[PDB]
Every structure is written in structure tokens, then in C-alpha cells.
Design a protein around this nucleic acid. Structure first.
Lengths: 57, 49
RNA sequence: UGCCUGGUGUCUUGGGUGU
């Protein structure tokens, strides 16, 4: 569909970052809280993006 | 009684399942952080599915 | 006059209850 599903949109060029409501953090104990799995995966993705940008230039 | 009754001693044993350890009710209470639905468990004042 | 408090992990696993 030209308006809604264009074929080139199947390739990701910009990634949407969900709000913390989607990936809430949990307090494992009284002091240390735990980052969610999605948060760690997004951190890894962003590190890889930074690495690619640094290497390219 | 018009009917005679079978009558005698028998060995009975009390099992761990008592009603006061199973009765549970909930009007409102804690909810999960991710889904904002009632938590699971009688010990946690949870809801029924 | 010295004045009163609601806020509860997550993920696995294991053993059980009723069909």
C-alpha cells in the first residue's frame, strides 16, 4: 500500500525507543535495582551504533 | 432408627489442607508494575484469573 | 496541647490441590 505499507520501510534506518513504561526497572533488593532486558539490549544496540560511527570516520 | 447402622472404630488422618489456609477475597489492592493488573497469589493479596 | 504511616521484586525451578 502506497499510503501505509511501503516496501522500503521494511528496512530499518531509524529505530523507535520505547518509553520506560514498556521496559520497567525492578528493585532486586533494598539498594540495587535491576535494568530490564530491553534496556540492556537497547544499550548494546546503541554501543554498536556508536562503534560503527566511530570506525567509519 | 428403622435401619441399623454400621458402627465401629476406624483410623482416620488429618490432611494438611485446611480451609483457613485457602479462603481468599479481594476488592482492590496491589497491581503489577508492567501491566497494572492484580498481582498473583493469596499471600500477596492477589486477584483471581 | 504534644500529636499519627500505607508502600512492595523479578526470573527460574521444584513439590503439591482439584478436576
Amino acid at each position: 500500500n502506497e499510503d501505509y505499507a511501503r516496501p522500503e520501510w521494511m528496512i530499518i534506518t531509524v529505530l523507535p525507543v520505547p518509553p520506560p513504561q514498556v521496559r520497567p526497572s525492578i528493585a532486586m533488593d533494598e539498594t540495587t535495582q535491576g535494568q530490564d532486558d530491553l534496556t540492556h539490549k537497547l544499550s548494546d544496540i546503541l554501543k554498536a551504533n556508536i562503534n560503527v560511527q566511530k570506525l567509519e570516520m | 432408627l428403622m435401619a441399623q447402622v454400621f458402627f465401629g472404630p476406624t483410623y482416620y488422618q488429618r490432611l494438611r489442607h485446611m480451609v483457613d489456609d485457602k479462603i481468599h477475597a479481594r476488592a482492590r489492592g496491589p497491581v503489577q508494575v508492567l501491566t497494572r493488573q492484580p498481582v498473583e497469589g493469596r499471600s500477596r493479596d492477589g486477584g483471581l484469573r
